[PDB]
Write a protein that binds this DNA or RNA. Structure first.
Length: 1536
RNA sequence: UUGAUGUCACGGAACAGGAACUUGAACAACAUCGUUAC
RNA sequence: UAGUAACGAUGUUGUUCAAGUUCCUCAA
C-alpha cells in the first residue's frame, strides 16, 4: 500500500563532510555536532576502526524541500492547482527534544486559520509537512555501497577563516572535510509516498524537488523517474658509505626540483673538463671497484622503467624521494564553532511576489602570481603551500570569492558588519545583498607544478641575515584563466548599484583576491562578461525554468550561453576605486645578480649561483623570464624609509612595534594590521644573456690561490654603453596620497635611493647593483617633487701627493730577489666596538671617491671565459681529450676594456691591512709541512733505530743492529730459494753474518817511505803463511794470528811492491805477513766460496723494498754513455733486475743497471743490496701515541701524491708502488723514541720528516684570522671593520674601472687599421710557491715571516723579445705556460669607491692607502714576479654627504683627515713603526737610469750560462739555515 | 545509516609582518728520490 | 774487544668552492 519514488542527486561542486563521533556527544550540548548538521556524515561499521562510507540523511532533504515549497508557494499566490493552501503550523509545546529550532522569519501568504489538527481534510502543505508515515524520506547512499579505508581516502581537511575588517588579519577559525565531485558525483535514495495523499501534493513535491539547488555546501541537481623508498635507501647508503653526508639537504632540494620534466636528468652539469666527477652528482665512484653506482647513474636508470614514463608518476616519484631525503637529513587548536540561539517563536514576515534572476557569466584571468594558503600535513619540505585539486589542478574556492565580495561591498559603503555568529539574521545593507549571491568553483586545467621561492630576514645591526630566518614559499604561475559564473535573485529590477560598482571595479583589473597581497600576489581581471535578467514572477517563464532544472548543468549552460547580452550594465553611482597605480623605471650601470643556488645546481652551465628567473603560462606551457623579486624591492624601500625617521629618539629600526602608531606601522603594516602599499615584480625589458666571472682567494703569506677557494658566478651584464633598464610598478592606497606626512617620507626614501645609495641585488661590495637613476610617474607630482637633486659650491682643487723619503742603494753587477717578506708588529687591537648598519651617525662621513688609475708597465688581466683565443684559422677545431697550449685575451664586458672591482678591492685591502697591522684576513691554518732529511750520520741518522710493531698496534719492539744482504747481484742467488712468505718480513729467516774482514800485506817495515799515510796499520801483529794452490790473480794463504789458536783461509792479490817476495812457490815455504782488520758488514744465505772464515749464524727478520734510487734523465748521462751498446728494455716485474755495468771499472766498486724505455728516458739503477734485522731484543717496547699515527698518515699522503716521481711503477718504493695507507701488525719501521714514547716512524733509511704542529700554531695568537665572536661584540681586527667579515657587513664598496683613452697595446696585432686588438706574448712557467723555503726547520726557531710584497723592476723587455729572465735561452711552448694579451704603459682608467659611516681617521688611512707618495706605485695583474703591472692612483673629488638634499663636495678637507689618520697611527704604536718603513722601501719604483736585474735562481750552477751559483750552492754560506729569515726580511738584499 | 509540527552554515578570505644575504685580487719557484764506502 | 763519513741525478704543475642562518612572530 505504498508507492516508492526513486531519486538521485548529482553534485556539481565539492561538497563538505563532518567528523564522526561516538553516540554520547550527539546531543544539543555539543558544539561540534551542531554546526556539523548541514553537512554529510561519515558512517563506519565495526566502531573504533576508521572504515566506512559517507551518506546524507533524509531530514536535511526534508528541510530543503520544505524551504523550497515555502519559497515557491508565495510566488503563485498560495494556489497550487485549484484550491488555496493553509499557512501551516511550526510550533511545538515540548522543547527537551528537537535539538535545533528555526530562526528564519517564515514567509507569509493569504493569512487565515492554521487548520487545526482535529480535521478530516488538510491543506496540501499539511500533507507535505507530514501531519504510518505520510511522506517518508529515505537516506541517500552511494550506488555500489563500497567500503573505504577512512575519511582521508576520499577527502582532505582544510582550515577555513574569519578575518576582520579594520585590522584586516584574522579571528577564530574552523575546519571541515570536503570531498571532490569528480570522484563521488552521485547519491541514490527513495521516498515512500502513501496512496491517498492527494493529487496536488505530488505536484508540489515535484516542483519543490526541481526548485532546490544546493544541499551540502555545493550545488546539485535532483532527478527522479615501492620504487622511491628503496631508491631513497640506496642513495642514503651511498652517501653514508662515503664521507659526503653533508650534501643531503642540498641533494633533497635539487632532486625535488626535477619534478618539472624528465628531460632534466640528461642535462645535468659536468666537470670543467667535461668529465663525470661532479662534487654532488657523481658521489660513489672510486679509483677501483667499478661496480659502484653513482647518483647520476641511479637517476638515469630510473627515468626509463616503463612505469615513470608519464608526467604524474615521475612527479610523484621525485616529490616523495625529496621528502624522504629531507626527513633523513632532518635528524642528523582553538576553533570557535557554533552557538546558535534557541528562539521560541519565529517572526513570520512577508516578502511579496516580485522575484527576478540575473546570471553573470565570463572569466577572470590572472595578472600576478596568485596564492591560496592550503598548508596541509604529511609534507614538511615547503612550509608554505598552495591549494590544488586531486589531479594537481589550480583552483580558487568559492569561500574566498564570497569573502572578497563581502569585503568589496563593505568598502563600497562605509559601515562594517556587526555579526557574532548566532541569533536572528543580520539586516544591514551588506547582508541583504550577500543573501542572494551564488558563486561557483573553478579548475583552470593548467596542471603544472608550482615554483619555489626562498625568503630571508636581515638583522639591521650587522647587515647579515638574522638567526633562524630562512623559509620557502610556492606560488602559482601568471596568466591562468578561471571560469566565472555569478547568480543573483531578488526583488529589484536586475542587479543593485553596489554589485554593479563592484563588478565595474573588477572589470578594470583591480580584483585583489587572496594571498600575500603585500608582496604583490594575485590580482585578477574579469573579462568577457555577459548578463541576462530572467523573470520568475509570471507562469510562462517559471515553468520553463522548472522544466530543465534551471540551467545549472552543462547542457543547460551551453543552451543558456546563447541568450546572454554582451557588456556589463553601467552603474548609476560610481565610487572611484581606492587604489592607485604608480610606475617605476630603474636604470643601472653595473652587473646584477639575484641569487638562486638550486637552479645553479641543476643547470647545465656548471656555475655556483645564477640569477632569479620566474615562469609564466601561455595557456598550456610555461616560459621563463628573468626578473627582480618583489620582496627584495619591498625590503629595500622599507629599509630606506626606516633609517631616516626618528620617532622620539630611537630610530624605527630598533622599535619592537608592539602597540605603537609608528610611521612604518601605518604604511608598511605590522603583525597587527595590514599594510597600505603593495609592490610587484620588475621585468628587464630585453633579453640579457648571462656572463661568467671567475674568482679566487689569494693567500697573504706565500701569496697564491688558497685551497678549496675557487668559485664563479653568472650575473647579468651591464655597462655604461648598455645600461640594463628595469621596469615595474606598485600600488598605493587612495587615503595615503592625500596625506602630506606620508608622501614626504616616501619622497625622502626614494630620493635617498636615487642618489646612489642602497644598491639592489647581491654582491654590491664588488660593484654590482649601483642604481644610476630612478623615476616614478602617475601620482600628479605628489611624491616625485622631493626627488630633485642638489649640491653646493664645487671649485676647490685636490691637493698634491707628498714626496717620499725611503730610498735604496741599487748598484750594478748585482742580482736581487723578488720576495722580501714584511715582518709585522706584535700589537693587534680589538678593543673597539663596531658601529652598526643602522641610522647615519652624527660624527661620521658618507660619500663617494673618484680615482684615476694609470699604468706604467704592461698589465695582464685575462678573460678566462675561453681558451685558444690565439688559434690559427682554416684548420681543425679541437681534439676532444688533450692538453693544449692555453691562450687568453684581455677582460671585456660589451666589447670594452674594463677592470673588475674585486682586483682593486684585494689590492687596496692588502695595502690597508699591512699599514694598520691588522689580523691576517685569509690564511691556511692546516697543512703541516714536511722536509726531506739529509744524509749524514751524526746529526740525523744516529737516532733512527730499526724496529717492529707488535701483534697489536700499541707497541714497537726494537732491534739490536743491522747488516746489508746483497740482492740484484750476480754472485749469489736469493730469489729462487726464498718464497714470498719470508721476503715480506712475516717470517724469520736464518742467515750467516760476518762483521770484520782481514786484509793481507807482505812487508810493513819497508813500506814506510812511500806509503802509510792513512794510520790504519796500528793493529797488525804477525803471521805465518803457507801456499796450497795457484790462481790467475790471487794467491792462497793459511795465516795463523799469534800462537796458532786459529787459522783463516783468504785470497791475497799482490802489487808492484810485493811481487819481488815471490818468484816460484813450492807449496811448503814459510812467508812472513801482517794481518789487519777492516769493516765488512754483510750477511749471506749459505756461505761464499771466497772467505771460508767463521761466520756467526744469527736469527732475525729479512725485508725488501724494491729497486729504488733511480737516476733517470733525458740527455744520455755519463753512465749511459761509454756503455757497450744495445741498452735493454725495462722489465714488467721486479725480482729479475740484474747488474749490467759498473760505475768504477778499475776496482769492482758500486754496480749500476742501465736501461731504456719506449720514450727518451734513460734509467741507471743503484742499490744492489737489502738490509737484514737480527737480534730482536725482547721485553723492551715503546708505546705509539696518536701523534705518530697522524705524522705517518701525512707521510703516506705525501709519498702517494707526487707529480715529480718516476714514470715507471717498478722503480718505486714499496710505500708508493702498492699504495699503502696504514701500518700493519708486522712490517718495516725505522723508529725514534725516548723513554717509553716513540716520536717518528719512517719507512726507509733516508725518508722525509713531518713536523708535529700545523702551520697555524707557528704564529702569534693575535695575528690569526680575526673572525668569530671575539648587536655585535667588540672583538674585531682593524681591517675587518672597514672591510667586512662573516656575520658583519663591510662599509666600503668598489666599482668597475673603465678605459677612456685608446688601447695602445704592447705589440701590434695581425690586422692593421683595427686598433682594438693586440698581439700575443708567451710567458714562463710560473710554478706554485714553496712555504718550505722560508721555514727551513721545525724546532721552535723558525716562525712565520711576513706578507710577501713583490718588488718593481723591468724584466718584461726580455719576455717581449722571447728569452728567459734567468738565462738567455729562448723559451719554448708547452702545455704548462700561457700566451696572454697585454696592454702597455700610458693607459688611464677611472673608477669610484663608495663609503659610509667612516670615521675621520679611517678615511685618512684609506686615502693614504689609495694614493701613495710620489715615488711609490701599486702592483696588480698576472705574473708580477716579473715586471708586469705597476699602477699609481690619483684621487679626484671626494664629495661628501650631509643631508638628503645637499651633498657638499668636500675637497678642501683632505689635509685634515690625513693628519688625523697619522695621529691615530702615532697613538697605537709610539715609536715602533719600522714595518711602515719597510713597506715604503718595498714599494719604491726606479725613478731613472737604474736597471735592477732581479730573477729566480736555477737548480745548479752548471745549467745557466752566467754561472751565478744556483739553489744547490745557496743552501750553504749565504742562505744557509739561520740567515734565511734575516736576509729575506730586509727589503733589498743582494741575491748573490 | 535520520526521524518528522521548526536546520539563514552560499552564516565565517588561512588571513597579518620578514632584502638569499655576509666574507674571498683567478693566482702562483725550488723541490723530488735513496744509499754507497770502509 | 766496537760502528763511522756524506754523497749521486735533474725535473716538475696546483685549487676548482669554503664558513654561516635553513624557520619564526601575532595568537593558542
Amino acid at each position: 500500500m505504498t508507492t516508492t519514488m526513486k531519486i538521485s542527486i548529482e553534485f556539481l561542486e565539492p561538497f563538505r563532510m563532518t567528523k564522526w563521533q561516538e553516540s554520547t556527544r550527539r546531543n544539543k550540548n555539543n558544539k561540534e555536532f551542531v554546526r556539523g548538521q548541514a553537512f554529510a556524515r561519515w558512517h563506519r561499521n565495526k566502531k573504533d576502526n576508521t572504515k566506512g562510507r559517507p551518506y546524507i540523511t533524509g531530514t536535511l532533504l526534508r528541510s530543503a524541500v520544505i524551504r523550497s515549497a515555502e519559497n515557491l508557494l508565495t510566488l503563485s499566490d498560495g494556489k497550487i492547482s485549484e484550491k488555496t493552501c493553509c499557512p501551516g503550523k511550526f510550533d511545538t509545546e515540548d522543547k527537551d527534544r528537537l535539538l535545533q529550532l528555526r530562526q528564519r522569519s517564515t514567509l507569509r501568504w493569504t493569512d487565515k486559520n492554521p487548520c487545526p489538527d482535529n480535521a478530516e481534510t488538510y491543506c496540501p502543505f499539511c500533507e507535505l509537512l507530514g501531519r504510518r508515515f505520510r511522506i517518508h524520506f529515505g537516506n541517500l547512499s552511494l550506488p555500489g555501497k563500497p567500503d573505504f579505508d577512512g575519511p582521508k581516502a576520499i577527502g582532505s581537511q582544510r582550515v577555513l577563516n574569519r578575518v576582520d575588517f579594520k585590522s584586516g588579519k584574522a579571528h577564530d577559525f574552523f575546519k571541515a572535510y570536503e570531498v571532490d565531485h569528480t570522484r563521488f558525483p552521485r547519491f541514490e535514495g527513495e521516498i515512500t509516498i502513501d496512496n491517498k495523499v492527494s493529487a496536488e501534493a505530488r505536484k508540489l513535491l515535484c516542483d519543490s524537488l526541481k526548485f532546490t539547488d544546493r544541499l551540502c555546501g555545493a550545488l546539485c541537481v535532483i532527478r527522479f523517474d615501492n620504487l622511491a623508498e628503496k631508491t631513497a635507501e640506496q642513495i642514503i647508503s651511498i652517501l653514508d658509505d662515503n664521507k659526503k653526508t653533508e650534501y643531503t639537504r642540498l641533494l633533497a632540494d635539487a632532486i625535488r626540483s626535477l619534478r618539472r620534466s624528465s628531460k632534466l636528468v640528461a642535462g645535468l652539469p659536468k666537470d670543467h673538463d667535461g668529465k663525470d666527477d661532479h662534487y654532488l652528482w657523481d658521489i660513489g665512484k672510486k679509483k677501483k671497484d667499478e661496480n659502484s653506482v653513482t647518483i647520476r647513474q641511479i637517476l638515469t636508470t630510473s627515468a626509463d622503467t616503463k612505469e615513470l614514463k608519464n608526467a604524474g608518476k615521475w612527479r610523484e616519484f621525485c616529490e616523495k624521494l625529496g621528502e624522504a631525503l629531507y626527513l633523513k637529513s632532518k635528524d642528523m587548536d582553538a576553533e570557535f564553532h557554533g552557538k546558535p540561539d534557541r528562539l521560541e517563536k519565529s517572526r513570520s514576515v512577508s516578502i511579496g511576489s516580485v522575484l527576478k534572476e540575473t546570471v553573470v557569466c565570463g572569466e577572470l584571468v590572472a595578472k600576478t602570481p596568485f596564492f591560496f594558503g592550503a598548508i596541509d600535513e604529511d609534507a614538511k619540505q615547503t612550509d608554505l603551500q598552495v591549494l590544488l585539486t586531486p589531479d594537481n589542478k589550480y583552483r580558487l574556492p568559492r569561500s574566498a570569492v564570497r569573502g572578497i565580495l563581502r569585503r568589496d561591498l563593505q568598502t563600497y559603503f562605509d559601515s562594517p558588519c556587526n555579526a557574532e555568529l548566532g541569533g536572528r539574521p543580520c539586516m544591514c545593507k551588506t547582508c541583504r545583498i550577500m543573501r542572494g549571491i551564488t558563486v561557483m568553483d573553478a579548475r583552470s586545467e593548467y596542471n603544472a607544478p608550482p615554483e619555489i621561492r626562498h625568503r630571508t630576514r636581515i638583522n639591521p645591526f650587522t647587515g647579515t641575515v638574522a638567526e633562524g630566518a630562512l623559509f620557502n614559499m610556492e606560488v602559482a604561475p601568471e596568466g591562468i584563466v578561471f571560469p566565472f559564473q555569478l547568480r543573483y535573485r531578488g526583488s529589484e529590477d536586475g542587479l543593485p548599484d553596489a554589485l554593479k560598482t563592484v563588478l565595474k571595479w573588477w572589470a578594470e583589473g583591480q580584483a585583489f583576491m587572496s594571498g600575500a597581497a603585500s608582496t604583490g600576489k594575485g590580482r585578477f581581471r574579469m573579462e568577457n562578461a555577459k548578463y541576462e535578467t530572467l523573470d520568475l514572477s509570471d507562469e510562462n517563464q517559471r515553468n520553463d525554468y522548472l522544466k530543465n532544472w534551471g540551467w545549472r548543468d552543462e547542457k543547460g549552460l551551453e543552451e543558456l550561453k546563447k541568450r546572454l547580452n554582451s557588456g556589463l550594465p553601467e552603474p548609476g553611482n560610481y565610487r572611484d576605486p581606492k587604489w592607485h597605480e604608480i610606475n617605476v623605471s630603474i636604470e643601472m650601470a653595473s652587473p646584477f645578480i639575484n641569487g638562486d643556488p638550486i637552479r645553479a645546481a641543476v643547470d647545465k652551465r656548471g656555475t655556483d649561483v645564477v640569477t632569479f628567473v620566474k615562469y609564466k603560462a601561455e595557456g598550456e606551457e610555461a616560459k621563463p623570464v628573468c626578473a627582480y623579486k618583489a620582496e627584495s624591492f619591498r625590503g629595500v624601500i622599507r629599509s630606506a624609509v626606516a633609517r631616516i625617521h626618528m620617532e622620539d629618539g630611537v630610530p624605527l629600526t630598533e622599535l619592537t612595534h608592539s602597540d605603537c602608531e609608528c610611521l612604518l606601522c601605518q604604511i608598511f603594516g605590522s603583525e597587527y594590521e595590514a599594510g597600505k602599499i603593495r609592490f610587484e615584480d620588475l621585468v628587464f625589458e630585453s633579453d640579457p644573456e648571462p656572463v661568467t666571472f671567475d674568482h679566487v682567494a689569494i693567500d697573504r703569506f706565500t701569496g697564491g690561490a688558497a685551497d678549496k677557494k675557487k668559485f664563479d658566478d653568472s650575473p647579468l651584464p651591464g655597462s655604461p654603453a648598455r645600461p640594463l633598464m628595469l621596469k615595474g610598478s606598485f600600488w598605493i592606497r587612495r587615503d595615503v596620497l592625500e596625506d602630506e606626512e606620508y608622501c614626504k617620507a616616501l619622497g625622502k626614501a626614494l630620493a635617498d635611493v636615487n642618489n646612489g645609495l642602497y644598491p639592489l641585488g647581491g654582491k654590491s661590495a664588488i660593484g654590482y647593483g649601483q642604481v644610476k637613476s630612478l623615476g616614478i610617474k602617475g601620482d600628479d607630482k605628489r611624491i616625485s617633487r622631493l626627488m630633485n637633486p642638489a649640491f653646493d659650491e664645487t671649485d676647490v682643487a685636490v691637493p698634491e701627493k707628498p714626496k717620499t723619503d725611503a730610498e735604496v742603494r741599487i748598484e750594478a753587477e748585482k742580482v736581487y730577489y723578488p720576495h722580501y717578506f714584511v715582518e709585522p708588529h706584535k700589537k693587534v687591537e680589538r678593543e673597539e666596538k663596531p658601529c652598526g648598519h643602522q641610522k647615519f651617525h652624527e660624527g661620521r662621513l658618507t660619500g663617494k671617491i673618484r680615482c684615476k688609475l694609470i699604468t706604467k708597465t704592461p698589465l695582464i688581466v685575462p678573460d678566462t671565459s675561453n681558451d685558444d683565443f690565439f688559434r690559427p684559422a682554416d684548420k681543425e677545431a679541437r681534439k676532444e681529450k688533450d692538453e693544449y697550449h692555453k691562450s687568453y685575451a684581455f677582460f671585456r664586458l660589451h666589447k670594452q676594456i674594463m677592470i673588475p672591482g674585486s682586483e682593486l678591492r684585494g689590492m687596496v685591502s692588502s695595502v690597508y691591512e699591512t699599514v694598520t697591522n691588522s689580523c691576517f684576513r685569509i690564511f691556511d691554518e692546516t697543512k703541516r709541512l714536511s722536509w726531506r732529511m739529509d744524509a749524514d750520520h751524526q746529526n740525523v741518522l744516529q737516532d733512527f733505530l730499526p724496529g717492529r710493531v707488535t701483534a697489536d698496534g700499541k707497541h714497537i719492539q726494537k732491534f739490536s743492529e743491522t747488516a746489508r744482504v746483497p740482492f740484484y747481484d750476480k754472485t749469489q742467488k736469493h730469489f729462487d730459494i726464498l718464497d714470498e712468505q719470508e721476503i715480506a718480513g712475516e717470517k724469520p729467516v736464518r742467515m750467516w753474518v760476518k762483521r770484520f774482514i782481514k786484509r793481507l800485506s807482505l812487508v810493513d817495515p819497508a813500506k814506510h817511505p812511500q806509503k802509510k799515510q792513512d794510520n790504519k796499520w796500528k793493529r797488525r801483529k804477525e803471521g805465518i803463511a803457507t801456499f796450497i794452490e795457484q790462481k790467475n790473480g790471487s794467491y792462497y794463504f793459511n795465516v795463523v794470528t799469534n800462537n796458532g789458536c786459529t787459522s783463516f783461509h783468504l785470497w791475497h792479490k799482490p802489487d808492484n811492491f810485493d811481487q819481488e817476495k815471490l818468484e816460484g812457490i813450492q807449496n811448503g815455504e814459510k812467508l812472513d805477513c801482517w794481518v789487519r782488520d777492516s769493516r765488512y758488514q754483510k750477511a749471506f744465505q749459505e756461505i761464499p766460496e771466497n772467505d771460508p772464515d767463521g761466520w756467526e749464524c744469527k736469527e732475525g727478520y729479512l725485508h725488501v723494498v724494491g729497486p729504488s734510487k733511480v737516476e733517470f734523465s733525458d740527455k744520455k748521462g755519463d753512465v749511459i754513455n761509454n756503455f757497450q751498446g744495445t741498452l735493454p728494455s725495462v722489465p714488467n716485474d721486479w725480482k729479475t733486475i740484474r747488474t749490467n755495468d759498473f760505475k768504477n771499472r778499475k776496482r769492482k766498486n758500486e754496480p749500476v743497471f742501465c736501461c731504456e724505455d719506449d720514450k727518451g728516458n734513460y734509467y741507471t739503477m743503484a742499490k744492489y743490496c737489502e738490509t737484514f734485522f737480527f737480534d730482536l731484543k725482547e721485553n723492551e717496547e715503546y708505546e705509539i701515541p696518536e701523534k705518530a699515527r697522524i705524522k705517518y698518515k701525512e707521510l703516506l699522503r705525501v709519498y702517494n701524491n707526487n707529480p715529480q716521481a718516476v714514470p715507471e711503477s717498478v722503480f718505486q718504493s714499496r710505500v708508493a708502488r702498492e699504495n699503502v695507507e696504514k701500518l700493519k701488525s708486522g712490517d718495516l719501521v725505522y723508529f725514534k723514541h725516548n723513554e717509553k714514547y716513540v716520536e717518528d716512524i719512517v719507512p726507509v733509511r733516508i725518508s722525509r720528516t713531518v713536523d708535529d704542529r700545523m702551520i697555524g700554531k707557528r704564529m702569534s695568537a693575535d695575528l690569526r684570522p680575526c673572525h668569530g665572536d671575539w648587536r655585535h661584540p667588540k672583538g674585531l681586527c682593524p681591517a675587518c671593520r672597514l672591510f667586512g667579515t662573516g656575520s658583519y657587513k663591510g662599509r666600503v664598496r668598489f666599482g668597475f674601472a673603465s678605459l677612456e683613452n685608446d688601447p695602445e697595446w704592447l705589440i701590434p696585432g695581425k690586422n692593421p687599421g683595427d686598433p682594438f686588438h693586440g698581439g700575443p706574448v708567451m710567458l714562463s712557467l710560473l710554478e706554485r710557491p714553496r712555504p718550505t723555503w722560508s721555514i727551513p726547520g721545525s724546532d721552535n726557531k723558525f716562525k712565520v715571516p711576513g706578507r710577501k710584497f713583490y718588488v718593481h723592476h723591468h724584466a718584461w723587455k726580455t719576455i717581449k723579445d722571447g728569452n728567459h729572465p734567468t738565462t738567455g735561452k729562448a723559451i719554448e711552448q708547452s702545455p704548462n705556460n700561457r700566451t696572454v694579451e697585454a696592454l702597455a704603459g700610458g693607459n688611464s682608467f677611472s673608477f669610484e669607491i663608495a663609503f659610509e659611516n667612516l670615521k675621520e681617521w679611517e678615511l685618512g688611512l684609506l686615502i693614504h692607502s689609495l694614493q701613495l707618495e710620489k715615488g711609490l706605485a701599486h702592483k696588480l695583474g698576472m705574473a708580477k714576479s716579473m715586471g708586469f703591472g705597476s699602477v699609481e692612483i690619483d684621487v679626484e673629488s671626494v664629495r661628501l654627504r650631509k643631508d638628503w638634499k645637499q651633498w657638499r663636495n668636500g675637497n678642501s678637507e683632505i689635509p685634515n683627515w690625513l693628519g688625523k689618520g697619522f695621529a691615530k697611527l702615532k697613538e697605537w704604536f709610539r715609536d715602533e713603526l719600522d714595518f711602515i718603513e719597510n713597506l715604503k722601501k718595498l714599494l719604491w719604483f726606479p725613478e731613472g737610469d737604474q736597471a735592477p736585474r732581479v730573477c729566480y735562481p736555477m737548480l745548479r750552477k752548471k745549467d745557466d750560462p752566467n754561472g751565478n751559483s744556483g739553489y744547490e750552492e745557496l743552501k750553504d754560506g749565504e742562505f744557509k739555515k739561520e740567515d734565511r729569515q734575516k736576509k729575506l726580511t730586509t727589503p733589498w738584499t743582494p741575491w748573490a
